[PDB]
Amino acid sequence: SAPLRVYVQCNPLLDVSAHVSDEFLVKYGLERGTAILLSERQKGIFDDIEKMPNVRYVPGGSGLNVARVAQWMQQAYKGKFVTYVGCIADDRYGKVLKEAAEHEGIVMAVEHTTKAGSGACAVCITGKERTLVADLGAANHLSSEHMRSPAVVRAMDESRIFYFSGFTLTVDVNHVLQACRKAREVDGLFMINLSAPFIMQFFSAQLGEVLPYTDIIVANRHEAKEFANMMKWDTDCVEEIARRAVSEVPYTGTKGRVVVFTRDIESTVLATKDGVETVPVPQLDQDKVIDMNGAGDAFMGGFLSAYAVGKDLRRCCETGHYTAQEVIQR
Incomplete structure (x- = not known):
């Protein structure tokens, strides 16, 4: 399929x-x-x-890791599944980054800036x-001009799921709102990862602009909690945060809002208009956890590959747990 x-x-x-x-x-x-x-x-x-x-x-970078893990799960469709957009420079690192990603099967519609090294x-x-x-180097300099280049516009036109890390909101929120419009045009799906707690603390205005267009919100416990702080939701219950994110954060889409909060040692929370479920996780024990840093990216990548082939939401989460585990234990 x-x-x-x-x-x-x-x-x-x-x-x-x-x-x-x-x-x-x-x-x-x-x-x-x-x-x-x-x-x-x-x-x-x-x-x-x-x-x-x-x-x-x-x-690397969080979204490129998601992209790589998602592509890894669909070896059959190299060049024919994931398009990645971001800004590098035309230097040895940017050269390695682009070619390695291409070899893995990702269409790299990246800008080459002169404003900084990769x-x-x-x-x-x-x-x-x-x-x-x-x-961050060049990543900080992704330009409106690249965002309106035919390659990027065609890639948006030809995609149906759009995934943006919260870090994109630190560069220029307008690049993100462009894709939100495109998702509306193609009747596609828009997803964000909250990425890091500082996003909600320091870039709440930018996040605010994007939220109404966001069909799926993904985050971990501490990001969920900082999200709560940002909305003035005074609670420590992640399940409560998920309910409110579904029904109390503005939503202008038609697919339905879904909220996925991962909780490290505890079960993942999955919420929609029809209610909240939890999705059990392994007790990651213990002299095995080599890459604690890339877990969230790997999870999102698994999630995204299952969502792309039509799996329902619990198995999207379960695919994500599986890819997070494999990547942690090398």
Whole structure:
């Protein structure tokens, strides 16, 4: 069964990943297991990490990871399923990022900007721990001019599911509203991931503009809770947050609103107009959890591939749990 055509938009980054010594982390002032933006303190880190004999370069950023996992689940339809849009630069990293993604079967309708080098994240591996240092680079400069280029307009015209990370809202909310309009035209489906709690705390106005067009909202517990804070919903119950997100956040669509809140150690919450269900999860135990950082991306990717082939909502969630588990345990 041929999947519906999916349009993914995010902030693309090359994952420059290597196993490194403890000394490496100290040299760049890095608190093991944390994730931060590049600052003066970490100047040199990319140059150094590239000298590690084990370094690997992998196309990254949250939405590109979703796209890759979703494509992985439908090997039969390389070049014929997922289109990805974002902004890179025309440099070695952008070259690796685009070609690696293409080889995996994703149509990369990316812009090449001159305003910055391609985004990247130094993934410093020490055993089962990953410490991240990110520089958004070119991703921040995705332009209106690219958004109205024939390739992007045709890709929107030809897709039926639209998936945007919350990070897209930090760049320019108008690029996102364009796709919301296109989803309306093609009678497609618009989905956002809430991405990170700071999105709701600092980019609530942008999120506000997009919500009415959003058919499916996906988030984890802490993002759900910051969403609650943003709506002035004073509760800690994620199930309550899901009900309100269904029925109390403006909705102008026709497909129906769906809310999926993942809850780490606890069951995933699934909500619609017909009520709330929970979807059990494994107790991820325990000397096995190698990639705690990419779990959410992997989940969304599984979800999205099941939704594209017509599976109902519980099995979309279950497909997502499965892909999150596989990716965590390498």
